[PDB]
Symmetry: C6
Subunit: 288 residues, 6 copies
Amino acid sequence: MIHLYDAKSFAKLRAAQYAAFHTDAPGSWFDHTSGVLESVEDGTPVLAIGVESGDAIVFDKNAQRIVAYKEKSVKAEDGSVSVVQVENGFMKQGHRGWLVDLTGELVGCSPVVAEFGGHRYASGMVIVTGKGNSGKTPLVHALGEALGGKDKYATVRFGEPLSGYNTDFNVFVDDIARAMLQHRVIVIDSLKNVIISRGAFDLLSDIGAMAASRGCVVIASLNPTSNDDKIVELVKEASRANSTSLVISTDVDGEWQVLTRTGEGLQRLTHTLQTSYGEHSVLTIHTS
Amino acid sequence: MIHLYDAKSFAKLRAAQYAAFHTDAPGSWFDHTSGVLESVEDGTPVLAIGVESGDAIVFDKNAQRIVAYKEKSVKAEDGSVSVVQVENGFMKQGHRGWLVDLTGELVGCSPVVAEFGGHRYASGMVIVTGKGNSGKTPLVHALGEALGGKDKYATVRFGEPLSGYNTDFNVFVDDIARAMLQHRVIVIDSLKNVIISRGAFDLLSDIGAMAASRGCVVIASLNPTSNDDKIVELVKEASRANSTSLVISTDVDGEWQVLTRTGEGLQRLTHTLQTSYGEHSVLTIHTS
Amino acid sequence: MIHLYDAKSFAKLRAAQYAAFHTDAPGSWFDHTSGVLESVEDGTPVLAIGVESGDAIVFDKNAQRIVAYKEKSVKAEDGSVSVVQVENGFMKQGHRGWLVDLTGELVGCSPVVAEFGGHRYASGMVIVTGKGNSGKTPLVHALGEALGGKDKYATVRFGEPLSGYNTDFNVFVDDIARAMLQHRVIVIDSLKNVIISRGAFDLLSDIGAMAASRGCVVIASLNPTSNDDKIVELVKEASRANSTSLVISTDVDGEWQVLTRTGEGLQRLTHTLQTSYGEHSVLTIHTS
Amino acid sequence: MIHLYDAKSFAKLRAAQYAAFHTDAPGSWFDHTSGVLESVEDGTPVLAIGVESGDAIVFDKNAQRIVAYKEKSVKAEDGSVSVVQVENGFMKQGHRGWLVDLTGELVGCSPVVAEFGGHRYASGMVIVTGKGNSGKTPLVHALGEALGGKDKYATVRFGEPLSGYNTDFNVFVDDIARAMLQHRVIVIDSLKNVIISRGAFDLLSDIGAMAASRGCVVIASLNPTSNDDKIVELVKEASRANSTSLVISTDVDGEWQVLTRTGEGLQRLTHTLQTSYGEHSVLTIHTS
Amino acid sequence: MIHLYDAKSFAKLRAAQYAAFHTDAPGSWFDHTSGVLESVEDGTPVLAIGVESGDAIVFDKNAQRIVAYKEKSVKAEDGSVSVVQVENGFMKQGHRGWLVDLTGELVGCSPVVAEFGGHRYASGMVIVTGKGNSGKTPLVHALGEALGGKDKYATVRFGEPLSGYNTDFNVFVDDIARAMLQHRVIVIDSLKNVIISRGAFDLLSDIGAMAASRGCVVIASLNPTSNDDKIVELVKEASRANSTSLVISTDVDGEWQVLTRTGEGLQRLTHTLQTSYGEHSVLTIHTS
Amino acid sequence: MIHLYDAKSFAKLRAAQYAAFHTDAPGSWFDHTSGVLESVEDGTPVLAIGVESGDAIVFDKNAQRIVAYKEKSVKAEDGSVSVVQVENGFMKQGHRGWLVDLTGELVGCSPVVAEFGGHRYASGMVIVTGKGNSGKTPLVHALGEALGGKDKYATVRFGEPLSGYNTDFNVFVDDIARAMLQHRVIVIDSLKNVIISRGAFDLLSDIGAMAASRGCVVIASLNPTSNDDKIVELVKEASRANSTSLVISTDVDGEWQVLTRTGEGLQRLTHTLQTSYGEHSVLTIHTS
Ligand SMILES: Nc1ncnc2c1ncn2[C@@H]1O[C@H](COP(=O)(O)OP(=O)(O)O)[C@@H](O)[C@H]1O
Ligand SMILES: Nc1ncnc2c1ncn2[C@@H]1O[C@H](COP(=O)(O)OP(=O)(O)O)[C@@H](O)[C@H]1O
Ligand SMILES: Nc1ncnc2c1ncn2[C@@H]1O[C@H](COP(=O)(O)OP(=O)(O)O)[C@@H](O)[C@H]1O
Ligand SMILES: Nc1ncnc2c1ncn2[C@@H]1O[C@H](COP(=O)(O)OP(=O)(O)O)[C@@H](O)[C@H]1O
Ligand SMILES: Nc1ncnc2c1ncn2[C@@H]1O[C@H](COP(=O)(O)OP(=O)(O)O)[C@@H](O)[C@H]1O
Ligand SMILES: Nc1ncnc2c1ncn2[C@@H]1O[C@H](COP(=O)(O)OP(=O)(O)O)[C@@H](O)[C@H]1O
């Protein structure tokens, strides 16, 4: 919705956004929105995501696709009316993104998803990219495990010439929808065949906000298919713009730089990761 | 409509346009158009705005969607006939923009929206842009609060990877329509995913004129998602031409330049803002 | 239609075209075509102009849209047949442009619209363009007044972020159609949003010939929205080719160069205008 | 159709093609095909030409449009079957170009159209182009008169901002069809709005062969809208490729170079024209 | 279909392919496929070729169009099923190319079409190209006659501004289909208007393989319509890759280089032609 | 589906993927998936592949197209549901790729297809490319034979101007589907006409993953149709990204570099091949 502010309510918002990253218990926002989703009436659409054509598919709170849903309207505090209809497996009335309100007045946050090695990490979309042919896949998995902490992370596989990899964009969006509905830490390998269809452009435009709203983290690899030239800089720019955090390779073997947007209008933080390989190319992120 | 002039009536027009910015009570045009809108007959379409596909959705004076409306025609002084018809929630006959006459003969104005720190600010569209990939969000909010003055400003959030941000263009235009119908000071964060769809092109083509007609100000952030190259100058040019006022970052920390189009054919004014951050990245614009 | 010539009739043609600019009473062609238009039978389509989609809307002599018109064919001297049919507000059969013969055998003219400051000015399209992003609006209005002479000039406003400006292309074509049907001197501010839709391309392609056929002058501003680079040269080139006269800014403050096509195959003339501002940015063109 | 050759029949063909340019009485081919056209059964389609959309309109021998024509097939010496159907004003079955056989075995000619100043000129398409803003219109008219000789030439006017100029492509193709059906010497002013729609591309691809097959000459002006740079060379190349003869401006005031394709695989000839202006910009081509 | 090999059966294939060019009687494959075509059952579709839109038209063994044909399926050795259905004159089921099996296991050949001047020439597509805007037409005809030997060659004329030249792509493909169905040596003048429509892209993609399968040679002229720049090398590359043999002009008057692909994976051979003109630009290729 | 991991199960995954390349019996994965495919119930869709339009055709285990198949859904461990429906020969519901589970939980492998000359080779897609326009065809055939070992390799021929070569993309996908369903070692000559249609893009995007899932190797030639310029680097880049292994030509006569992706996140290996020609251009890869 739209929100109205004066100096006082704006200062309160910024303090709450700051708290959502710096002082809330890690993963608290994810559990909060899990509760919101569990409260949703049975059969109710909760999430719509674009398929390759630019039509949207719609899911309920248990990550089941909805194929038929009679028109239903809802009136927000704003005065804005949301209408949702599903017919023949596709959204006929509605919008892409969350179809129920997960955030309320608390918008523009990068809710803390996990804390690891003395650093807090934001929910939202994390693009792992930069110069190089190689090394992003082990990093996304190492980050997945580390941010998962006590919990397993979910892996979405797409568009690589390896066994068992889905290459159909419409199964990809089904996987991502389910992942965000059910898991706090999600890895996508990779965004190669994403980066262009209407659905693919919808995904890059939508996924960060969807994830940040849920309080889950989506950790996605992106190789520059192009040279190690300076189309690299173009890829970093596009990635930075459409992600909540950016992780980029560096000059130095095994080192990565993490750039975090801590919230709307808030400080952007940077820190470095040092990593090393063990057996079978399993990567460890050093902390101590 | 079209308007006829000779030397004498043109001189009168330019005097009236000059006054609309320089001597009218700040915010007085907004109050006038609120009065015009309030006196419209119940159910009358007042505003049409393009959705992503290039079709238009239509609102009444209370910012509620008009879904069905039988063809009605109105005869202007110009002799021209305007027609409005809404069917299945979409405009079938009519034009984008204001469907009631807010201006009459008084056109080509940048009606003063507010006065702050010894400077008058124009209604219409204000694009906050320039080199850098940060700093615009705190500025748009500071400007929103400052120009709001005694009133709250409305915030429209779109297309950033942060919690609660809508990323559906059709919701965006609903938000902006409601905002202009109901508030004098409006902030958009951001124009990233705007600037391209038919609806998105319609928006940059229409919003400045819509806001100037109402006497409201729309303050919109725009990062060069492209480089800090030049690129930057292309964005400045495009922004300047399609906005009423332009606010651009400079090589001095915290300093911004404001470039105001004071009306049709009138002087373009410049002044500089100095700013600083307090707690939680809340920006203050220095004044006296 | 097509016209046949030998050396003798071609010499007569060129003499007649020459006279249409150099020796006819200024504005006499306009007065002639006004009479032709006034004598047109009631309900007759007289003008077809492209709307945004590339379809065409049709007007009668009073500038009212024709919604329904049963097929009517007309046989030319050429043996060629013209047909007009209008259905559901759109041209079903016919061509863009004037649908009645305004002039007779005399074609390829730049009929003199007015004389001012020792110089004759052509009807047709006049594009006011060149380097800089400022100064064109006051010039088009000063020209409008000066060429209007004893008569008021009509102002068409389109696609600028100021109060009262239409930003819908289909209202634009309506305005231009009414203007050319009813007035000898017309100002368009501006061509920004035209220069691309099929309707917009049609407009650039059609308006000069329409205006020259009527004997009215359309004076249109065009900024290079792009840089003050060699994009200026390209805009100038494209403008010159699709206009009857070109007015371009120069190196010298307040000075403009006017380049006039005096008719088919005839001499192109050049002269300069000197100008200055008075109060409220009202520009005067110097003469004596 | 296809044609089979051995060394002997090929030598005979080349000798006949050579004769068609060098030794036949000027304009003889035009009179021959006029006879062929006059022999055509009443109501029979003889010519199809592309309209702007890429559909084709169809004419009979008297240059009247055909709107309804029941399917009719014809078997050529080749074994190839030609089918022609017209429905609702458009070709439903058939091909663009001549729908009756004007040429027989005598194909690949540039039949002599006229002789002037000690030079033979070919039928087909003659593009008058080259560096410069100006000067092509007087040249096309001077050539028209000169090649017309005893006969008047036909003028097709299209797409210039001057009085009486058609700007609708579909009337343009109607004019050109009629001109080629009825006249040996045809001038088009200009190809500006041609050079892109399917119909426009069809015209450039078709018109030379259509004209050469008839034995008529189409003399068309083409300005480079672009600079006097070296997009000029690109325009010359495209023109040369799609015309039977090319006339290009030179370094020297009033001088033009004529480049003639004398037939299939035959010598290309060059000569120069010297010209001067009289009153009202009437151009004379010097001979003696 | 697909074919299985081991070392022994692959060696046999390469021997057979080598023989198809180097030791088979010249023109013997053509005679064989004529026999295959003659033994097809009456009414059987034998060839499908794409028309401009990308649909396909279908011919029988006598090069007559098949307009309606009930679905029929055939079981290959491969286990694969081919199906053919024609409805309203267009292929509804099937594939472009030969609809009967002309080759069996003997695939990847450049069957020798003729021997002339001590050199064997391959069937398939031969593109005659290179720098210059003249000389290709006389060469293609000289090569047609020379390779025709005891037989006449067939000439397909397309897309040049000369008398009797078809310029409709759909007639072009009918001409080429008939030519390949009925003659061993075929000349196309020219490929200008080919090289872009779906049908045109289909043609360059298909014709070489179609001709090589038949054992006929298609000799096609191609000018760089683009510059004599480099450009030229792009055309050479594109031509080489999509033809069986390439013939290119050189810096020596009258000299051409022939580059022959002798079969799948086999050596590419080169030899040079010397040529001279006689009367009426008839070119002779020097031999002994 | 999506898969969940913690540190322990991820370590097991990487160990299993490592084993799939380094220690599994060469060709064992293929033999496994053959058994899965053979045990599939009669009529079950097993493979969907995109045709030229971007629709998908569906095959059963015997490589026969499925024309009609009533909706059938299957529930995964993931909770996700897969559905297949085929109507009028096209997939109505489902995804591109394998429609049955060939492998189980083990994904992200490059299953060893064969061992030759002291080196293990991965299944999946192998693109043979690099500088030069010659030499790739003999290499793909030599690899096919060598990796075939005791078994024959299947050859898919597409889009070259030689006898018997299919040039219809839809037959191509049929051939590739049959090949992957029935053979462990597959050669495609070539990708020229693939590298763009939606089907062609689907193919590049899908085939590596399809082949790796099956445990078959597809060995595909690709010339840079463009120059031996830095376009080579771009082709190499695009090829590497969409292939499991890359084989590229070098500076040295007969020498090729093989670059193998051994599995998800695993080491990429490099080794060189030395080669020489025997009779009829049969290439041998040296070993001892
Ligand atoms: N033990 C190791 N030492 C060094 N590099 C390794 C090791 N294991 C894997 N790699 C590299 O890391 C990459 C693994 O990630 P991969 O998915 O192949 O590429 P990306 O991560 O860029 O998508 C491989 O390209 C490989 O070259
Ligand atoms: N206290 C602070 N001091 C200096 N810079 C800050 C501070 N807080 C935030 N910023 C900067 O201001 C930006 C906030 O606006 P943001 O939305 O991130 O970018 P933009 O405003 O350009 O869209 C951040 O990029 C951050 O780097
Ligand atoms: N009194 C003045 N002195 C100098 N410049 C002026 C004066 N009044 C207006 N201008 C300039 O002339 C322009 C008026 O025309 P405008 O419509 O703003 O641009 P354009 O004419 O290029 O469309 C303004 O940009 C302003 O900078
Ligand atoms: N008497 C003259 N002396 C010199 N130049 C002339 C004379 N008359 C006309 N011209 C030039 O010739 C041109 C006439 O042709 P025009 O149609 O205007 O351009 P184009 O022929 O290139 O289409 C004019 O541009 C004008 O500048
Ligand atoms: N007798 C001749 N001597 C030299 N050149 C000739 C002779 N006859 C024709 N030519 C050249 O050969 C060309 C004939 O082929 P043409 O169709 O015009 O071009 P292309 O063959 O490249 O399509 C002409 O351009 C002409 O310049
Ligand atoms: N015996 C040989 N010696 C040297 N080069 C050869 C020999 N046989 C064939 N070649 C070259 O190898 C190529 C065979 O592969 P081909 O299919 O023609 O090209 P590509 O393999 O690049 O698709 C030919 O271009 C030819 O020039």
